[PDB]
Design a protein around this ligand. Structure first.
Ligand SMILES: [Mg+2]
Ligand SMILES: [Mg+2]
Ligand SMILES: [Mg+2]
Ligand SMILES: [Mg+2]
Ligand SMILES: [Mg+2]
Ligand SMILES: [Mg+2]
Ligand SMILES: [Mg+2]
Ligand SMILES: [Mg+2]
Ligand SMILES: [Mg+2]
Ligand SMILES: [Mg+2]
Ligand SMILES: [Mg+2]
Ligand SMILES: [Mg+2]
Ligand SMILES: [Mg+2]
Ligand SMILES: [Mg+2]
Ligand SMILES: [Mg+2]
Ligand SMILES: [Mg+2]
Ligand SMILES: [Mg+2]
Ligand SMILES: [Mg+2]
Ligand SMILES: [Mg+2]
Ligand SMILES: [Mg+2]
Ligand SMILES: [Mg+2]
Ligand SMILES: [Mg+2]
Ligand SMILES: [Mg+2]
Ligand SMILES: [Mg+2]
Ligand SMILES: [Mg+2]
Ligand SMILES: [Mg+2]
Ligand SMILES: [Mg+2]
Ligand SMILES: [Mg+2]
Ligand SMILES: [Mg+2]
Ligand SMILES: [Mg+2]
Ligand SMILES: [Mg+2]
Ligand SMILES: [Mg+2]
Ligand SMILES: [Mg+2]
Ligand SMILES: [Mg+2]
Ligand SMILES: [Mg+2]
Ligand SMILES: [Mg+2]
Ligand SMILES: [Mg+2]
Ligand SMILES: [Mg+2]
Ligand SMILES: [Mg+2]
Ligand SMILES: [Mg+2]
Ligand SMILES: [Mg+2]
Ligand SMILES: [Mg+2]
Ligand SMILES: [Mg+2]
Ligand SMILES: [Mg+2]
Ligand SMILES: [Mg+2]
Ligand SMILES: [Mg+2]
Ligand SMILES: [Mg+2]
Ligand SMILES: [Mg+2]
Ligand SMILES: [Mg+2]
Ligand SMILES: [Mg+2]
Ligand SMILES: [Mg+2]
Ligand SMILES: [Mg+2]
Ligand SMILES: [Mg+2]
Ligand SMILES: [Mg+2]
Ligand SMILES: [Mg+2]
Lengths: 87, 205, 80, 81
RNA sequence: GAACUGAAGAGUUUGAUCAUGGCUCAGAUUGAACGCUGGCGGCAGGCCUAACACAUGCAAGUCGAGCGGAUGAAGGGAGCUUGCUCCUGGAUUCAGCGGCGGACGGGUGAGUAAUGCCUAGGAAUCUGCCUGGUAGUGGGGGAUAACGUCCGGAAACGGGCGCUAAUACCGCAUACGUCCUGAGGGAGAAAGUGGGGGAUCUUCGGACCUCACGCUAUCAGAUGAGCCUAGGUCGGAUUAGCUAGUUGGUGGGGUAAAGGCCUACCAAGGCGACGAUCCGUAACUGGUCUGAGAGGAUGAUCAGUCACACUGGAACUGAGACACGGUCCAGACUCCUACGGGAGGCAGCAGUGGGGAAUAUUGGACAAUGGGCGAAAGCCUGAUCCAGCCAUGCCGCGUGUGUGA
RNA sequence: AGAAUAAGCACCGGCUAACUUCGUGCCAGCAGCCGCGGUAAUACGAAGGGUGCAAGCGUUAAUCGGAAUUACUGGGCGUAAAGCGCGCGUAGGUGGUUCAGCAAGUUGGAUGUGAAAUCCCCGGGCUCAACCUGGGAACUGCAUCCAAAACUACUGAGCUA
């Protein structure tokens, strides 16, 4: 780079990336656990995973890592799958 | 720009009135103004229609001392103006400042009137105008400088123009060296010999 | 007041879809004579009640698939 | 934001200004949405110094458009009249 | 009330004539060039070719009312003396963290014959700064840069150990608005700074009341952007067949949003002489030049949209980028080197080489209009405002005037 | 203070405004098209004299016009270029006459848009103009509705040329 503000923006960008990656991994981990819980054909563990996953999903949606429509879509679809499994 | 050269060789070539001198003695007994110039001068030289258009266009341009870019701009403006462009061209070309300060009686020749108007010696409402192309709106009191009212060239030009005719549409007060224009001249006012239609025939080709 | 479009069914070999031909007569820009042009559209037939030859009227909606954004509102004429 | 400012028409050393309602991320005389009047810094003769349209300006302010400093001064001076 | 009102022919085939028929001419215009010649002013315009390679100089910073640190004046006083130091204080300046801006403004027309442009529409979306309402801004923690110390290096600097600040970061406290969940219940945030002050607890340290800026959740308004449908958009048929994610459905995934956008199965569909596919060529429009008109040619200046940024790809940061002076990888070409490794991108403004028939100064200032930053002074601005060279264009004025046989 | 201090270029046979002489002698040369020149050249090269433009004047390259010479407005095919060697027939184009309906074409109107500038008309400013600028007009286009039914199309029922 040439202007020092470009350098500062760059380094703040790698810091922001190294931050955001961990939290994106965390949310993906929680939804993945939930999804493999439903796909394993068990209800109680699916209930527990959903209850333990919604708070982090919504906290992250508010935190600005992901967009809120995405979180709402995830919640609705997973709840629909579990309710379908309930029968 | 302007034309510099003999002022009666042109008259000899054209063979018509072509006012270009003070008119002190006469129009004839200076240059035998009936033959075209040069060695080949006695021949009448019957000329075609294009000759007619060229000859009268040169006639009008030389009598009013206007160049051809300016003249064609004048013609385009006349064509733009409504109501029989042929006389619109004459009416608009008459309202030039130098020709007005001539015809108001302040100058011996068109060239001398241009001499006076260019060197900032004439007013319109007191404001210095020195463009020998200014189109004078009707109503303006064209006058010479209060400083310049004592010059004898204006006096001699005025006494010479005292006997040249009356146009019967301007109102001129001569004591104070001032003019006044009320309304634009009509077609019948100007010399009804040269036709305007042949010019517009020339420029329509 | 939906903006409909009337047309003639041409082919319906794809499930829950129908092909409609719409005929217009456009004036030639210079020669002043009218020429009949045609347009082919795909419409969503939810209950595949449109056979070939029927004459129907469709309506514009959001895209249902790629190159399929019209839905038939009702059949107005059948076929022999 | 969307702001009201001056667009420089006219000729060299003879300015003229259009009071333009433009998005602030646009050129000086680029695209706009509406024009409310003009300001002439030469006046003279029958030329008017300034004129604006009051109702459209009130509408634009009621929709929250920030006027520039010179535009603000001229609009308040016009509102005085 | 006015918005137009306009159309010319000639020469040349013959010993001569009429007709047909081609060639040439008289007009208006160019970003024009060349030859001869040359006084001035005003307004405009100025690499059309090599999107060929580029020396140096300039073209994006700003905030101490966010934060530690260090520079710490003037001083109220003291010591010995007339100079310094020091207690308390303290006006200035900024390397670093942090907040905005850098996605605007500016340039070019390579690609692109349709995911572009123009006309008319519509439904499933997002949106910082701006405006109007509503509800709040409580309490904790773990670090780290700079700063010391050590190692390593030619440099950019890299690494080990110690400690610190916040409007940097993450839990915790509740939900007028919101999200999903069918009712049922559940889910999800905040940062404090500057100016004052009556009374109260108390070091009016602080708590408390007010104002200013600022922060959080949400509804609406504009502003900007994304997506879909119908019609139009160069020449060639001596280019007639093209397509297997291709056409439609179901389940799932994905995006802010509809959708074969992606995937697994189901059937064999879809487009085309109303010109599909392929080849060549080319940014599009308002508009410009001509013409009586209908048309014909065209896209110099100015304005709207699109695309690109040495060549080819990819993502991160954000409200918005696949990013014009940001990052990473690979390549070509120039350069430094201690041989380990590094640096560069004028299609930003002047400038040079080269190409060409041919297109200019390595100039000034923030004075004005805008832009970015800050509350305010104010800084930055080759955008902009002015200068320079050029008969390149349009317009205007001069080189005089009368008499003089 | 001083007329002081600042005119060139092309052309002159016809088309196209403007002529004589001298020098060569189908040589040298000119040229947009016809064409000039071989011993009086208004056409070559020079002189005088004129004609046309003018701080410019010519030349070249490019577009439209003239060209009704791609003819919708607005051409032709016996002999000048131009009727397939001749039938049958697909898509397409066209459709005798009456009654009735509908309203796509067709006609009139309303509404929204057709960005600004540029073009046109009337004003304002710089001594005028170039140039700048106010107001209006216009942008033949496109879309959505309302009304009419003569003609065409679509629907039904007839008639016989
Ligand atoms: Mg929380
Ligand atoms: Mg949030
Ligand atoms: Mg001139
Ligand atoms: Mg002969
Ligand atoms: Mg003949
Ligand atoms: Mg600093
Ligand atoms: Mg741009
Ligand atoms: Mg270029
Ligand atoms: Mg192609
Ligand atoms: Mg924070
Ligand atoms: Mg289309
Ligand atoms: Mg498949
Ligand atoms: Mg489906
Ligand atoms: Mg599917
Ligand atoms: Mg699509
Ligand atoms: Mg083709
Ligand atoms: Mg092109
Ligand atoms: Mg190209
Ligand atoms: Mg084109
Ligand atoms: Mg292009
Ligand atoms: Mg015209
Ligand atoms: Mg014509
Ligand atoms: Mg260009
Ligand atoms: Mg533009
Ligand atoms: Mg790009
Ligand atoms: Mg790229
Ligand atoms: Mg290059
Ligand atoms: Mg690169
Ligand atoms: Mg982001
Ligand atoms: Mg950038
Ligand atoms: Mg660069
Ligand atoms: Mg440059
Ligand atoms: Mg060069
Ligand atoms: Mg060269
Ligand atoms: Mg400013
Ligand atoms: Mg700087
Ligand atoms: Mg000049
Ligand atoms: Mg020249
Ligand atoms: Mg002649
Ligand atoms: Mg000659
Ligand atoms: Mg001789
Ligand atoms: Mg000769
Ligand atoms: Mg023609
Ligand atoms: Mg021609
Ligand atoms: Mg013929
Ligand atoms: Mg024959
Ligand atoms: Mg026959
Ligand atoms: Mg045949
Ligand atoms: Mg037949
Ligand atoms: Mg048939
Ligand atoms: Mg009939
Ligand atoms: Mg028929
Ligand atoms: Mg109509
Ligand atoms: Mg317009
Ligand atoms: Mg009716």
């Amino acid at each position: 780079a040439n202007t020092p503000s470009a350098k500062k923006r760059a380094k703040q960008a790698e810091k922001r990336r190294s931050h955001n990656a961990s939290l994106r991994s965390m949310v993906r981990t929680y939804i993945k656990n939930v999804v493999k819980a439903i796909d394993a054909k068990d209800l109680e563990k699916a209930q527990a995973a959903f209850t333990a996953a919604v708070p982090v999903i919504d906290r992250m949606a508010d935190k600005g890592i992901i967009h809120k429509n995405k979180a709402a879509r995830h919640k609705s679809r997973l709840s629909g799958h579990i309710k379908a499994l309930s029968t | 720009a302007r034309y510099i050269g003999p002022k009666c060789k042109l008259s000899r070539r054209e063979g018509t009135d072509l006012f270009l001198k003070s008119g002190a003695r006469a129009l004839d007994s200076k240059c035998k103004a009936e033959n075209v110039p040069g060695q080949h001068g006695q021949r009448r030289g019957r000329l075609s229609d294009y000759g007619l258009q060229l000859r009268e266009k040169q006639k009008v341009r030389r009598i009013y001392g206007v160049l051809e870019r300016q003249f064609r701009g004048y013609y385009q403006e006349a064509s733009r103006r409504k109501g029989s462009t042929g006389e619109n061209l004459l009416q608009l070309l008459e309202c030039r400042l130098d020709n007005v300060v001539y015809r108001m009686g302040f100058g011996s020749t068109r060239s001398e009137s241009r001499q006076l108007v260019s060197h900032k010696a004439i007013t319109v409402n007191g404001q210095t105008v020195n463009i020998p192309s200014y189109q004078v709106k009707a109503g303006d009191v064209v006058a010479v400088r209060e400083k310049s009212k004592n010059q004898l060239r204006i006096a001699q030009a005025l006494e010479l123009c005292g006997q040249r005719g009356r146009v019967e549409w301007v109102e001129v007060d001569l004591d104070k060296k001032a003019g006044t224009f009320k309304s634009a001249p009509a077609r019948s006012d100007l010399s009804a010999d040269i036709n305007e239609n042949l010019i517009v025939e020339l420029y329509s080709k | 007041t939906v903006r409909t479009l009337t047309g003639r069914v041409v082919s319906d070999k794809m499930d829950k879809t129908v092909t409609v031909l719409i005929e217009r007569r456009v004036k030639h820009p210079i020669y002043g004579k009218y020429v009949k042009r045609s347009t082919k559209l795909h419409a969503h037939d939810e209950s595949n009640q449109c056979r070939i030859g029927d004459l129907v009227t469709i309506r514009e909606t959001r895209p249902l698939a790629k190159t399929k954004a019209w839905t038939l509102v009702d059949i107005v004429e059948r076929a022999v | 934001m969307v702001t009201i400012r001056l667009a420089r028409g006219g000729s060299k050393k003879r300015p003229f200004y259009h009071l333009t309602v433009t998005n602030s991320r646009n050129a000086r005389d680029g695209r706009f949405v509406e024009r409310i009047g003009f300001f002439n810094p030469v006046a003279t003769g029958g030329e008017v110094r300034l004129s604006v349209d009051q109702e459209r300006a009130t509408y634009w302010l009621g929709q929250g458009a920030q006027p520039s400093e010179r535009v603000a001064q001229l609009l308040k001076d016009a509102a005085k009249a």
